[PDB]
């Protein structure tokens, strides 16, 4: 399928153990997506002082279009030193990988794969 439903756990940035995926924008994209299929990616809100805290090349989940059965169609845009790979809508937030933190929220996701 073009799009997968996903429930994506959203994580308080000070709980993330693994602050990103990669070394690389195509690495992170990689392995972003990789993680999304496994179920092992956590969301984090995107607010002021969270980026900081997180490891470089971010993987947003931006908004792909204005939501079938609750879930956002979304796709990924990767950034390295404030230049974006991808071009798409609001961020929802930015991508980690999940080691079993403990979430605050769900966010439903239509990703277009």
Do not use: N, W
């Not at 602050?19 to 195509?26: A, I, P």
């Not at 994209?29 to 995107?46: F, I, M, N, P």
């Not at 908004?63 to 079938?68: C, H, I, N, V």
């Not at 609001?90 to 079993?100: A, D, I, Q």
């Amino acid at each position: 399928k073009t799009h997968v439903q996903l429930s994506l756990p959203v994580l308080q940035v000070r709980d993330v153990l693994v602050r990103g995926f990669g070394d690389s924008v195509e690495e992170v994209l990689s392995e972003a997506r990789q993680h999304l299929k496994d179920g092992t990616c956590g969301l984090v809100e995107v607010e002021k002082g969270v980026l900081p805290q997180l490891e470089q090349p971010y993987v947003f989940i931006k908004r792909s279009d204005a939501a079938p059965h609750g879930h956002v169609m979304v796709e990924l845009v990767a950034e390295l030193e404030g230049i974006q790979y991808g071009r798409s809508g609001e961020t929802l937030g930015v991508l980690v990988p999940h080691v079993g933190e403990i979430p605050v929220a769900y966010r439903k996701v239509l990703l277009r794969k």
